[PDB]
């Protein structure tokens, strides 16, 4: 009858919000133009040959506060002209050859990235890139998160050496909600990240998985981590094979109206955008009526059925969510579109949870639908 | 007042059509999806995990008879399951790391690919992939064209291992591939190399570059080759530096109505499609009404101006063309859309040439104005 949650607000440095996601590409242009059309994100900044960067090509797409950065190495034929200082062709080519299209870097704003970096390394973080001040403006540092993903710190006083790009595109995507990594072993990954960050544990209510969510003090930076359960097979085990180890599994994208967004995105799956996981049976939506009846009107339940949208509830609020098919060649990274309703006071982070209860709700309605 | 062409029809094996182009990618899925929307090409066939292929991902777009194959290597941890028998992980990753996104293979239908291959290698051709017969249906061979591009021979009796994709659908008028142009450091050697093993003849010409066009007996397979002229800097040199050697410069796509195609493609430039080269000044389109006004109505002139379409003439016919910006990160491969008008007798290949004349016409319209 009552679910109680604790939060020791034990961040070791001041953390603000997600800043950007950096994908490592083979060709940044075609990936950036695919994502731009498929998600309704505007071309906003660039650092390439047209701006003087002869080391790497990097395009920034934005949608409200969401920033997707796409970076590809040029031919080596030194690094002075590069704008992102942690970059080198060897690590890029290795990453791509080993994992294919995927997230290299999850970037969080912090108060002081040099502060954030030294506290992290003192508490166990494996450094990947030390603090660099770019043009006495922004400071950027990087530490290993899991596998080949880096956590990147960004602090201020898009980036120096980027040029801005001038009715544009917008399907309602407003911000990144959470970024989820797949690891072989929850326990050590958790003690390692929680060890250097001080992020606390967020709460709960076959799956093939064990999950735990790491959260900053205000629970606005959310980092869930999944482990495969051995012994139908775990998609997470499947992820680890095709991704050649740990790596980022999915990004959830918060929308201000998931119906508009889903309408826009489903218009474009067959003309260059993203395809979606097959939708629940009709029994799943008959059961919505009185499981969230008090939050969704009957017209919005008809809307979820037309769009294949999943709904979940926890102690605080309600979550509307839908999962995209893998973004590239391998069955590795995919995207989630979500809208959280409730928990207003501003809206609190994790309002509605992460959809864990939809495993049963999907299985229940699939076995209901046969009979 | 008269231009005379010769054609020794000296092909050494029977050649039919441009069959497909194969791009080698980092990620086949995004490139193919981008090309699909920008060009109006249907997802036609595929060979990948969902088909059992654990070696490479390969997607086929088609528009009319034009076929674009996009191929990328999967992880080697997971080669009999591959459907393209010339594929190996190492070569692909070296290619992409050396050249970026680009064309790996120009494929032509030949009567018999093992015959075509054996005659080529005796007459100088460097082999890359020996004849392989697939499921007793199609034979496949590759010799070296220039740089890391191979000329690929296909003969029959899309490919075994490909599953068809069901699709309302996408179509902007692209109907076939017209020519495919390589950039090399030294025209002469490459010409004698390629012409030596094909028997292809020189199709004749009615700056920054020297070019010659090798054609098949019926001149339906057309392969121009560019050389940089040294000492404004040669865009062919710029190509050679950024692609790290010889490689394919552009593919010209024949459209059955370039006006239709361009309205479709320019609408999509800012929403994922392709952008175009800056268009000529207005004097270019004023000097058109007295240069091609016997072929295009005044309303078609106004249509070329609205779309930045270039027009040239030659002895037999008239060519409508326009060029795209570079397709990937590097300023290397780009696309051209063309429509040939004239030369009916079916239409003869190369009716109108290749746009040699527009260098002069673009300069002089710019000195005017
Ligand atoms: C197969 S499903 O029931 O529709 C479902 C639900 C939540 C999710 C995820 O967003 C959550 C969550 O985003 C964090 C990690 C634990 C999960 O499973 C996923 Cl990937 C799939
Ligand atoms: C600079 S332009 O007048 O727009 C022009 C014309 C022809 C072409 C080419 O299609 C032809 C032709 O495709 C190959 C032989 C040499 C050329 O220049 C190009 Cl890339 C540009
Ligand atoms: Co051309």
UniProtKB/Swiss-Prot annotation, chain A:
The keyword Cytoplasm applies. GO terms for biological process: L-phenylalanine catabolic process; tyrosine catabolic process. It holds the Pfam family Glyoxalase. Fe cation binds at residues 178, 250, 336. Binds 1 Fe cation per subunit. Keywords: Cytoplasm, Dioxygenase, Iron, Metal-binding, Oxidoreductase, Phenylalanine catabolism, Repeat, Tyrosine catabolism. It comes from the Eukaryota. This is 4-hydroxyphenylpyruvate dioxygenase. It comes from Arabidopsis thaliana.
